């Protein structure tokens, strides 16, 4: 058993490393997913401003008219 | 021995990935700031002369 | 291995501090830049109001 053991021991010791880094990896990939989610939310803030630009367009037409009238 | 290379691997598993991804974030942020400035400039200067002329 | 795990848990604890304190200071810098960008508004706006009157 001491011989088969060598294989069992090396695999758990490395399997543990899968976990040693997966613990770092999940935190990293979760970060990426999360940041992509944040980027939307901040893009939406910019989209609020996009609508403001259309409000400005109407304001501009009103001024063209009131300034002329 | 590999346990030591493996603890060292946190740096060789590339701490600099952080530096690289961060650099990409600092970078892309600036690239997109320039795109913003361009769109903001389109709007910021498109005005006013008619009103002041009128 | 008992000894090496001591060393490489110690290195780990050291890295915990190094990585998080490096990042902490990097955010302090970005934070102040952004916050200052906000405070300069208010510094300018005092005169914006005066300018608006005339």
């Amino acid at each position: 058993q001491m011989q088969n053991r060598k294989e069992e021991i090396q695999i758990l010791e490395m399997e543990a490393q899968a976990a040693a880094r997966l613990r770092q990896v999940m935190e990293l990939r979760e970060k990426e997913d999360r940041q992509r989610m944040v980027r939307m939310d901040m893009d939406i803030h910019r989209q609020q401003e996009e609508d403001r630009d259309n409000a400005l367009i109407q304001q501009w037409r009103v001024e063209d008219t009131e300034m002329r009238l | 021995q590999q346990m030591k290379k493996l603890e060292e691997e946190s740096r060789k598993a590339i701490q600099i990935a952080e530096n690289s991804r961060k650099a990409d974030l600092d970078f892309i942020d600036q690239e997109l700031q320039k795109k913003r400035a361009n769109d903001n400039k389109f709007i910021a200067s498109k005005m006013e002369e008619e009103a002041i002329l009128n | 291995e008992a000894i090496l795990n001591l060393e490489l848990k110690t290195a780990g604890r050291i890295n915990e501090v190094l990585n998080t304190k490096t990042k902490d200071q990097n955010i302090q810098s970005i934070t102040l830049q952004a916050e200052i960008a906000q405070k300069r508004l208010d510094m300018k706006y005092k005169q914006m109001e005066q300018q608006i009157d005339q």
């Binding site: 803030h45 304001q59 001024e63 | 700031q33 903001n40 006013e48 | 906000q38 508004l41």
Partner: peptide, 23 residues
């Protein structure tokens, strides 16, 4: 990024305000 954006975007108002003030 968003703050400097917001600021420079905000000041477009001041230019709009200049037009509104004019009339």
């Amino acid at each position: 990024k968003m703050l400097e954006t917001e600021i420079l975007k905000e000041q477009q108002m001041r230019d709009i305000e200049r037009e509104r003030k004019l009339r």
